[PDB]
Amino acid sequence: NYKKPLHNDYQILDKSKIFGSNSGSFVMYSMKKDKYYIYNEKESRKRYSPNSTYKIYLAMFGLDRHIINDENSRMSWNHKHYPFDAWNKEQDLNTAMQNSVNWYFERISDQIPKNYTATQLKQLNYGNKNLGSYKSYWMEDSLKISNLEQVIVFKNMMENHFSKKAKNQLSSSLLIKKNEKYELYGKTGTGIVNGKYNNGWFVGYVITNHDKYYFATHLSDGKPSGKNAELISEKILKEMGVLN
């Protein structure tokens, strides 16, 4: 588990109603208040594979290492057929992130030296920092991070040696929704084991006209999909008044 003390007078939450038959946790952090809000704190410290939420980090490393940049983040399709036509075409960072296009992020990852990743995960305090065989190590494999860490680590990364332009391009790629009241950013992740949803994530942040909130939902049981984790996140954010 993640055992490092949280030195914050955080607000305990009971979001059991919204979670329903799902198990997991929800963590939020307000920048302006310097305050965490946690549903199921013990569970929030349990480490799980990040699955595609790690594409946030692969994108950042890709930018930082100049594998991709603001003028050009395009990668050509090699004509391999996938079951979603959104994957069967050239991509840029925005479309790759939006459609969670594995081959795009795999190509980035295949260009990253293991020593560089190890250094970044150390600096970032990214969970167990366990790169294992270092192939698709973020997908139901060696690398594990807790829900509480997902918030702390993302917030700290974005809020160091990563450039402002890298952070801006990454942020633009994660934008899901914008209206008059808020902008919502985030990334889903889903672990499937032998057809069963086993691990669901939505990790993101909300910018309002008065504050910025980092958040993460993880689902460990019930219907633990990334899609469900996003729905629950959005329900909790609304119910807590963050979206007005």
DSSP labels for the chain? Answer: -------S-PEEE--HHHHTT-EEEEEEEETTTTEEEEESHHHHT-EE--GGGGHHHHHHHHHHTTSS-SS---B---S---SSGGGSS-B-HHHHHHTT-HHHHHHHHHTS-HHHHHHHHHHHT-TT---TTSSSTTSSSS--EEHHHHHHHHHHHH---S-HHHHHHHHHHHEEEE-SSEEEEEEEEEEEETTEEEEEEEEEEEEESS-EEEEEEEEEESS--HHHHHHHHHHHHHHTTTT-
Resolution (A): 1.8
Q: Burial letters for 117-138: b for 16+ Cβ neighbours within 10 Å, e otherwise? A: beebbeebebbebebeeeebbb
Residue 52: active-site member: yes
Q: Which CATH architecture has domain 1-244?
A: 3-Layer(aba) Sandwich (3.40)
- Domain ranges for the chain: 1-244
CA 62 vs. chain centroid, Å, equals 16
Whole-angstrom distance, CA of residue 127 vs CA of residue 2 = 7
Select from 185, 216, 213, 212 the least CA-distant residue to 202: 216
- Taking only Cα atoms into account, the Rg of the chain, rounded to an integer number of angstroms, comes to 17
Residue 152 CA to residue 92 CA, distance in Å, equals 28
Query: 213 near 29, Cβ under 8 Å?
Result: yes
Listed residue (232, 178, 179, 182) closest to 203, CA to CA: 232
Determination technique used = X-ray
- As to burial, measured by CB atoms within 10 angstroms (0-12 exposed, 13-18 middle, 19+ buried), residue 161 is exposed
Please identify which of the residues 25, 49, 52, 109 carries the catalytic annotation. Answer: 52
Tokens representing residue 153 in the block: 């680590």
